[PDB]
């Protein structure tokens, strides 16, 4: 966790969640369960899809290798030929491998980011009306019904409420 969210303060991942990358599990009186944030999950889809097609597009004219043959007294330009074709094939092979390693890391950190920013979206609503447990969960100083939560997920959450 570069952002410290994923495998950082939240422990594992939610096997149960089969609806998006990130979301919630709630533990209330009408029911329990999982939901996924369209806002953030959809934004991430758009993210990596754009990453992929820009990687593919960045290397779509690359280097073609035509066959030239040389005779017996042309070992110098034949070598020149060989080592230039080889040489290009090598820098393009490097570029692909390098670009991949980098974008992989920056992508993992991207998902991590999305988590910590979701956790902050909720935390920046329930300020007083819940306590930060420490493992990514909020315990309620009130009672929170299914419909209270729908107000939460879509982030319009009613703060006009006491505390103690």
């Amino acid at each position: 966790g570069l952002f410290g969210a994923i495998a950082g303060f939240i422990e594992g991942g939610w096997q149960g969640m089969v609806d998006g990358w990130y979301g919630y599990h709630h533990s209330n009186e009408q029911g329990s369960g999982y939901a996924a944030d369209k806002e953030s999950t959809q934004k991430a889809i758009d993210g990596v899809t754009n990453k992929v097609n820009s990687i593919i597009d960045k290397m779509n004219t690359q280097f073609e290798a035509v066959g030239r043959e040389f005779n017996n007294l042309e070992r110098r330009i034949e070598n020149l030929n060989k080592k230039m074709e080889d040489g290009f094939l090598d820098v393009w092979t490097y570029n692909a491998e390098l670009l991949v390693l980098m974008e992989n890391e920056r992508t993992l950190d991207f998902h991590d980011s999305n988590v910590k920013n979701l956790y902050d979206k909720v935390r920046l609503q329930l300020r007083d009306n819940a306590k930060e447990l420490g493992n990514g969960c909020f315990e309620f100083y009130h009672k929170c019904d299914n419909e209270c939560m729908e107000s939460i997920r879509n982030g319009t959450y009613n703060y006009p409420q006491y505390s103690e």
């Binding site: 495998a7 533990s27 043959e69 998902h111 309620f140």
Partner: protein, 321 residues
């Protein structure tokens, strides 16, 4: 009382990927962008079928090795396959001028139409049917290249030849000819009477004059004699003029180039598969949407981009544990 939690996906995928700082890191979803599979076959490229010389080189094909009749008349092709070490090359020993340059032209042509530009019949004052070796056997009997013709003396006489020829087609002609280099002075008179000879050849562009080199050489295919071949490209409406008094292996069939286009000469040991592809390498064909492959750098058709790695996996999902 109630809590509410925030968390992410984990699942049952075993698929590691690599970052700059850590290797073999398991994740949820992962995309593969490297194609590592061919069909081990030589296919048609979009329905137009390759020229696969079998044990022939380009030289035996073009010149007419009598071991090369499979290719007397060759349809439009998509790309050519030559073996590393074709057995049927120059059956009468010698050389073929500017050979790699002509192989380079061939990588830019998809169709020749062989046409006869000087009939074997047209030779009134020389013999044109006794020009044959044991080094070029056709079915046991002494033969020789089909596309050129090894003229020799008649009635103890090689009167000087003047043959002109005007390309009146819409296409460039590939035209081949040669000179025969005898083994000794005795051979030279036995074959052409006149002890001292030449072959001059001119177009708009080509102005050469060849004299044969009589000389003792090691034996190749039984012979110390050599044959040396030359070629040119005749422009539509230009003429080629030949004048010689011996040692002249005259053309008989030339090639019209009726389809320039994108082609390749592939070195491969393989043989005709009987399939169709949009992308061919010399170790087999590729059917893949992948943007990369690591099969072989020389490639023809709509092709993934060659890369030397044996593993490229792109992370889509997140960390899994």
């Amino acid at each position: 009382q109630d809590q509410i939690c925030i968390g992410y996906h984990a699942n049952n995928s075993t698929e590691q990927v690599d970052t700059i700082m850590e290797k073999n890191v398991t994740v949820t979803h992962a995309q593969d962008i490297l194609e590592k599979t061919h069909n081990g076959k030589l296919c048609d490229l979009d329905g137009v079928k390759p020229l696969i010389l079998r044990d022939c080189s380009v030289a035996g094909w073009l010149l007419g090795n009598p071991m090369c009749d499979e290719f007397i008349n060759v349809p439009e092709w998509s790309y050519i396959v030559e073996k590393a070490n074709p057995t049927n090359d120059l059956c009468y020993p010698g050389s073929f001028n500017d050979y790699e340059e002509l192989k380079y032209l061939l990588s830019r042509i998809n169709h020749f139409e062989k046409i006869q530009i000087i009939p074997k019949s047209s030779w009134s004052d020389h013999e044109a049917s006794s020009g044959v070796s044991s080094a070029c056997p056709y079915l046991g009997s002494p033969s020789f290249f089909r596309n050129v013709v090894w003229l020799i003396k008649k009635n103890s006489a090689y009167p000087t030849i003047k043959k002109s020829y005007n390309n009146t087609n819409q296409e460039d002609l590939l035209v081949l000819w040669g000179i025969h280099h005898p083994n000794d002075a005795a051979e030279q008179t036995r074959l052409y009477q006149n002890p001292t000879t030449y072959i001059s050849i001119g177009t708009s562009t080509l102005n050469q004059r060849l004299v044969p080199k009589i000389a003792t050489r090691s034996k190749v295919n039984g012979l110390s004699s050599r044959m040396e071949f030359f070629w040119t490209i005749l422009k539509p409406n230009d003429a080629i003029n030949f004048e010689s008094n011996g040692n002249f292996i005259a053309p008989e069939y030339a090639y019209k180039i009726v389809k320039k286009g994108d082609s390749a000469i592939m070195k491969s040991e393989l043989e005709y598969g009987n399939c169709n592809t949009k992308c061919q390498t010399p170790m087999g064909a590729i059917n893949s949407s992948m943007p990369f492959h690591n099969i072989h750098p020389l490639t023809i058709g709509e092709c993934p981009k060659y890369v030397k790695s044996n593993r490229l996996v792109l992370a889509t999902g997140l960390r899994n544990s």
